[PDB]
Design a protein around this ligand. Structure first.
Ligand SMILES: [Mn+2]
Ligand SMILES: [Mn+2]
Ligand SMILES: [Mn+2]
Ligand SMILES: [Mn+2]
Ligand code: NA
Ligand code: NA
Ligand code: NA
Length: 320
DNA sequence: CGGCAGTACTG
DNA sequence: CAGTACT
DNA sequence: GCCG
C-alpha cells in the first residue's frame, strides 16, 4: 500500500460511519480505501485523486488536506460514542441498532451489558466468547476443524463432500472462522443430514454453542480438544449438487468480490446468488427483481465466469 | 435522483 | 416485519 | 461516500 498515510485516517471515519449506522456512506469510504490501497503510486494531486474509480471530489478534497496538513480535521469531531458503539457491535448478534439502543440507555462497558442488558440467546453467546471471536486462527487449525466436520459427515455417508471455503480457500495464513460447504454428488443424499451431523459433533464436545440452526445453514461455535484451545466460529452450509458451483463461489468470497460479480451480472440482465446464475431476469426501475428468469447450467466455477464474460480467477485472486 | 448483492435466520 | 448475519 |  502506497497510501497508508491516507487510508489510515479514512478507515477511522469509515468505521465511525459504519458503527453509527450510516451504511452507504461507510461503503463509499470502504471502496475508496481499497481503491487507494491498490494504486501503485502515492497520490500527489487533486487531479490525481479523481483519476481513481471510487474517489470523487469529496474524497479527493480529504486526501489533499491529508498531504498538505498531514491530518484530517473531521477526525477531531467524531462522536465520543463511537468507541462504545464499536465495543458493543463486536458482540455477535448485536449490530448498529442494538448498540445505539444500549448507548442511549446509558450503557458504556461490557460490564454494563453483562449486568444490566437484555440479551438475545445469540448475544449472550457472543458476549461469552467476546475475546475469542475477535481473534483469528492459524490456517493449520482451520484444517483441523474442516477435517473434524468431514470425518463426522463421512461417517454417515461416505459420498458426502466437504470443503472449507472463506478465507481458508482463498489461501490466507490466518482465518477468522471456518466455512464448510457440504454436498453430495448423487443430488439427493445431502438431505436431512444436519440432524445427525450436528448431533454427532455435539456428542463429541466439539460443538459448544449454536447461533443459527436453519434447514440449509448452521452458524455456531466449536473448540478442538486439548489445552491451549480457543472457541472458534464455525459455519456449515448444505446444498444440492446442482448448486455446488454457485455455492462454492459464494462461500469462497471475498464479500467485496461477491458483491462486485453480482453487480456485474445485474448490468447484463442476469442475477447471481448462492443458488444459481440466472439470465433474462426482469427488474423494475428500482433494480428490484419482478421476474425470475432462467437458471443457467453452471457445473463449475469456471462456467460462472464464462457466462458473465470474465476471465477465470483462482480463489487467491478473489481476496478483494 | 437514487442504487449501492442477494440471500437466510430470528423473534 | 426490522435486525443481523454470511460470503 | 461514489457514480450512472
Ligand atoms: Mn469466514
Ligand atoms: Mn463464516
Ligand atoms: Mn474460549
Ligand atoms: Mn467475513
Ligand atoms: Na474517480
Ligand atoms: Na455484532
Ligand atoms: Na443502571
Amino acid at each position: 500500500n502506497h497510501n497508508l498515510h491516507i487510508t489510515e485516517k479514512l478507515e477511522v471515519l469509515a468505521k465511525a460511519y459504519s458503527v453509527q449506522g450510516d451504511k452507504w456512506r461507510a461503503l463509499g469510504y470502504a471502496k475508496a480505501i481499497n481503491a487507494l490501497k491498490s494504486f501503485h503510486k502515492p497520490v500527489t494531486s487533486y487531479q490525481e485523486a479523481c483519476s481513481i474509480p471510487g474517489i470523487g471530489k469529496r474524497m479527493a478534497e480529504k486526501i489533499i488536506e491529508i498531504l498538505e496538513s498531514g491530518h484530517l480535521r473531521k477526525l477531531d469531531h467524531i462522536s465520543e460514542s463511537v468507541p462504545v458503539l464499536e465495543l458493543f457491535s463486536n458482540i455477535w448478534g448485536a449490530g448498529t441498532k442494538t448498540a445505539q439502543m444500549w448507548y442511549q440507555q446509558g450503557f458504556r462497558s461490557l460490564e454494563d451489558i453483562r449486568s444490566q442488558a437484555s440479551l438475545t440467546t445469540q448475544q449472550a453467546i457472543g458476549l461469552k466468547h467476546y475475546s475469542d471471536f475477535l481473534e483469528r486462527m492459524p490456517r493449520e487449525e482451520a484444517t483441523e476443524i474442516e477435517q473434524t466436520v468431514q470425518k463426522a459427515a463421512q461417517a454417515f455417508n461416505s459420498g458426502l463432500l466437504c470443503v472449507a471455503c472463506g478465507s481458508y480457500r482463498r489461501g490466507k495464513a490466518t482465518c477468522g472462522d471456518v466455512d464448510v460447504l457440504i454436498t453430495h454428488p448423487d443430488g439427493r443424499s445431502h438431505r436431512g443430514i444436519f440432524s445427525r451431523l450436528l448431533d454427532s459433533l455435539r456428542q463429541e464436545g466439539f460443538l459448544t454453542d449454536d447461533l443459527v440452526k436453519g434447514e440449509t445453514k448452521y452458524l455456531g461455535v466449536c473448540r478442538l480438544p486439548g489445552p491451549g484451545r480457543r472457541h472458534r466460529r464455525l459455519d456449515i452450509i448444505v446444498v444440492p449438487y446442482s448448486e455446488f458451483a454457485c455455492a462454492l463461489l459464494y462461500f469462497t468470497g471475498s464479500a467485496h468480490f461477491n458483491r462486485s460479480m453480482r453487480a456485474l451480472a445485474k448490468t447484463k440482465g442476469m442475477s447471481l446468488s448462492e443458488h444459481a446464475l440466472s439470465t433474462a431476469v426482469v427488474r423494475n426501475t428500482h433494480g428490484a427483481k419482478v421476474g425470475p428468469g432462467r437458471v443457467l447450467p453452471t457445473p463449475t466455477e469456471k462456467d460462472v465466469f464464462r457466462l458473465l464474460g470474465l476471465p477465470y480467477r483462482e480463489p487467491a485472486e478473489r481476496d478483494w
